[PDB]
């Protein structure tokens, strides 16, 4: 315990505070605590938010600055997914500061890590399966923004992007926002269609999961009959799907649900 108090103190006041950010980020996986300690502590949240807002002028294009803020991001990712601090964090409108980070189109390793770390926060926010999180996210341009990520950039960030989407689709309120209109429907389908053709990996298992989810809506079930990528209907992905039972049971049902 008491190497933590000194680091948290440093984070709020003590001059280094990047080292502390680094240290606390490394120890964030133990004791099943400190999430509450981070929130309940005075000046921490204000400070953690100050680290983030200092990266705004730097969003015009970097370096270790990007590593520093990324460490504050995992700290916020630790606060999120913690039942006590999750809904407090959510209702405090803190994560909405992570969207400008996610808006960055730069493909440099730095901005790749920036978006990747930031994506972990929102991904962790939907990790515990809370409906209020969904209805909060759908207030914002996230879903179209994830769709931008899913087709391009890195396989890692893509894996996080498809996951966040799958969570939203899983919820009844999310499956309503998407698949509300043809504009939104064909926005998601084309990207999923793209990834399949552009394709062991988890990206395939999540894509199948998303289609199986869209198979629920009848209006979507009809359009998917024609709009389903033929690759899945084929045996092309069978060999790699032999190792995953869950992915196989979902794909088989998706085909079974397809047509009649």
């Amino acid at each position: 315990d008491p190497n933590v108090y000194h680091w948290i103190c440093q984070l709020t006041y003590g001059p280094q505070k990047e080292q502390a950010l680094l240290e606390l980020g490394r120890k964030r996986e133990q004791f099943d605590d400190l999430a509450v300690v981070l929130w309940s502590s005075f000046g921490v949240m204000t400070s953690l938010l100050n680290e983030i807002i200092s990266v705004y002028p730097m969003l015009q294009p970097s370096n270790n600055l990007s590593n520093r803020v990324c460490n504050a991001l995992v700290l916020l990712q630790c606060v999120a997914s913690h039942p006590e601090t999750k809904h407090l964090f959510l209702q405090a409108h803190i994560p909405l500061f992570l969207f400008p980070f996610l808006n960055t189109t730069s493909r440099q390793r730095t901005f790749e890590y920036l978006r990747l770390t930031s994506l972990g926060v929102i991904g962790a926010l939907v990790k515990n399966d809370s409906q209020d999180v969904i209805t909060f996210l759908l207030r914002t341009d996230i879903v179209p923004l994830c769709l931008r990520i899913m087709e391009s950039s890195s396989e890692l960030s893509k894996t996080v992007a498809i996951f966040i989407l799958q969570k939203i689709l899983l919820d009844d309120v999310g499956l309503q926002y998407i698949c509300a209109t043809l504009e939104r429907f064909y926005a998601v389908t084309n990207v999923l269609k793209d990834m399949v053709e552009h394709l062991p990996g988890r990206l395939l298992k999540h894509i199948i999961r998303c289609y199986l989810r869209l198979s629920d809506d009848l209006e979507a079930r009809r359009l998917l009959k024609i709009v389903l990528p033929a690759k899945l209907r084929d045996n092309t992905f069978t060999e790699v799907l032999r190792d995953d039972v869950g992915s196989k049971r979902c794909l088989a049902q998706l085909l079974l649900t397809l047509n009649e």
Binding site: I8, T12, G43, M45, A92, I94
Partner: protein, 185 residues
Amino acid sequence: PFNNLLGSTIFVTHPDLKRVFQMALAKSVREILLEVVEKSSGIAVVTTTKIILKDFATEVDESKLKTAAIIMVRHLAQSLARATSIEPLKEGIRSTMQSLELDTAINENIGIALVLIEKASMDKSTQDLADQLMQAIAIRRYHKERRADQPFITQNTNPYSLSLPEPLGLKGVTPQQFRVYEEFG
């Protein structure tokens, strides 16, 4: 508009083009101004409200609350404004320019347009907060006049902040150091 659009070359120094340029900026600003201010300030006043009240639960002297409440939401709104407005403003500024080398000229003068969307989103933030801080500002006025020497607040919840430790946590009153954190940035 004002101050000649200095400094720059080309579009600034040519009068005939100078007019349609100023017309492009104004149209650009008025387009996204309404959209930005409502959203940015909306996040600013809410996210500050929840943060300030949690940290200031034991704090008295609402003037000391107001000081740390104002500068937090003001700077946080101004930062969310500039960040939000920068991209669509320019993209619109060029889009409305071609309809009726560009980037070099506008990036010099984009400062003014940004300062308006900032100033605006700041003032509405300082406003919406003050109206939402009313109950929290009033409940301390009663507790100030009616019961003096008594300990302060604990309005709803400080279950895990009831813990002992050094000034990472709630005290009494807010120490000069803890009040210094929100006093700057």
